């Protein structure tokens, strides 16, 4: 009867219809709904348990600059920054804190290091004047949470009262049992009822850019659940 | 939809971005002030067990770690910013954490010494002793964390609404 | 009543008066007294237990060279040398085996590697001729021990007969429970009585230099104790 | 001041910088020569349990590790530097330690095989078998350590003063 | 001689070993201007109707802003204050230092009783408003208890042994 | 539990935030609110009792003149005047009835005497023509009173119906037990509830001038209260 699956921000067991993504909002700090999963017709019910079900959620943002004659090799940012689980070094991390891509030169761009104290990052390359650039740094200073919807956009409850910060979420090394993250709360729902994963943070996150090298979908969520067939 | 009636003793953790916490910059040779202040919210009761993890991750304004001879002291207070000798916990040095793996590793995870409790209106302070001719603390980059949610290792901070339980007042008087 | 505190080579719970530091002696190999802690007026008593109370003690020394036209990039030493808990690599250690500072160029100086067999170390930079230099390498080939004093400079006993070598002290990775160091002996004293921490080794250690980057006080001690209020 | 009357069975460890120990350089294919010699001090008794850690960290003169096919053998000896077949322990190879984490790790911590005892005047030697056409041992960089004080893992070397206990003579 | 009782009567002041002072600037509540400590194997007692008399001065030899505040306060060991046991939370004004000690009317007493075990501390915190002159310890003086007088009281002392 | 403290027009046990001062109004004679104290978060409650709790309140005003060639040595006033508890003499008073300060000559100005019958006062010095002057004479012809506010600017009651005149307040020698002032009424309040001290008088009082010699804050209030921790 019961199984233990993973569910992702796209498709998976659902089929890309009863998922929906969305960005947050910047100027009004508000508890937006960045993702939501609706139980399809075919399942009987879905469960969700804390301290039983593992999780992963790698968000990012997007920013841009303008090429100049001066040898920049460094860019400021609008988002608080830190390393992935802490380290000054690049390529030792579980994943890159930041990625950069040049529109003109359709190539990746490495990263040397950064201050990780102020909103700063180094670039290893020397961008030319007029060249367009994009960057997908780490995100910080946010809160994440869950809530349930009974087919109508009509809340009935909340999985767990207190929000967990995405900041801390990045801080812990993920994907290690014993050190794996496990939120609290014990939810369950049935056909056409929705779980919404909600965000409260200033910086504008992303889901799709169509010019990001390390995979198509920039960010990701991967959550464990229990299903009754 | 269905949600489980989670127990009142909720498992939580503390950090900078909360309402009932505050911080402010610090200079040098400067014990008396709380670099970080905590206060009990209204009609709640917080509980910190003896095996609770601890994790200060202070910084310098230029983005550096400070002199590891620096000292950190968590300390309970009576109301009115009035410290007390008994009930003190975590008199540690600022060095010997290895902030990279500190929370990450249960080895590096430095726990408290004795139990602790916070009645609805009480204070816990975090004093810092920096030797002179050193750089000061910068609140933008500093941080505290205590308790270990989201891990089979470590413990978590207990919280309960005072209005729910009847012996909440009994435990508050018990301290 | 009872607590479990840490005590350091400066101030702490005491107040910088009833501590005192001192260097060792070189030509007469003698069991000097490098540190000592006197129980203040306010406490009732202090205890000390082995296999109960953890510890840390990072010593160093000081040496100097003279700049020359020839590209040195390496210096010999007068002290036996090894890595911090063993490794050929720098920046992986729990702390740097060695630090160097240029008086003229008021900057740090990195380290590449060393032989760690003879009294040798590499420098990554290229010092200029005439430039003054200082270096604070690891220390080796010593013994450490404890003794008690009854207000008069008048010994009554010894915590533990057999000395432990500082060499081994550096060898073990510190600050790991299970692998943490825990000496033997069960001492206790009262008001104005002193515990002296003693050194027997050739090389001249240091406590203060006023030109050391990684903190003001070069060396350090951090010991666990139990106190009766 | 106050000190506790610690038990006579004190928990200790052995290393190079001690008076009742000695070493000497070794070349190649020289089994009979002991690289390291140990002797019982006067009116003391040493005890080495079976689960005692062991830790040789020999080196080459240039500062290198030697051929791991090299062999190390701890061995008890009767007086007059005379070996014995019984009582020997730790006939191991010089490889397969990983000196980096050796004492650090209880896994890498290689223990002895059987118990051992050292009466007041006795000898324990450490023979080494190096294959030919190899580099020799250098005493300046080599070292031995045995026993594990100062760690909840491992065991420690017991010592006692002979003049304290009455049945120490019977135990010897 | 008539054997005097162990409960001896004394008055406190600056020139004693078990007292100390240190200069103060402005807006410095935590710093004690004056510290007191219990000597060894003695017990001090301060009743509720005990007179009090600070005479803080400026470096130039002037009185400070009377909006300044003075607070005597008992402390646990390790320089640790306490809320209970505090006495004499008064202002620096309203003394008439000329007639303060001499006139019982202008003499100010404490509020509640007090006791000093052999190793304990009593501090005297001062709160000066900013943009004001600092305290000078050379000219300042403290007195509590009025020995040799009909009015007021005297500080009791007794040997613990 | 209970203590007996003093509270002042600045800071004190409160912390300079939950105090607020204000001046009165002149042309519409109205029961202004010159001072108010809000019970902070940390306390449990505050009490207030008459014939138990002493008090002090020294108000003043401000006026100015213009230097002239003629040797003035006397100024009229817009406020009824009398000595401090009555006396023709200056420097015998508990405090000076009046203070004067010259802007040009940044010095105090003594006072000889005054008529104390009409709105008159003497100056001992000889001000020059064009020199600017300030004076902070005693205040008279007023009423003072108390009232409570329940967090909202919304009165519930009044401590004592009948006002006491500040005139009489100056007349009695203050700070003498037996002759000390003790109003009537028995009030008590709790967190964030306010006690307002109110004024009804014509002349414009002051709290701060930044050029007053005898202390920074010109006027003052010092009231006894009882607090539950």
UniProtKB/TrEMBL annotation, chains A, C, F:
This is VP4. The lineage of its organism: Viruses, Singelaviria, Helvetiavirae, Dividoviricota, Laserviricetes.
TrEMBL record, chain D:
It comes from the Viruses. This is VP7. It comes from Haloarcula hispanica icosahedral virus 2.
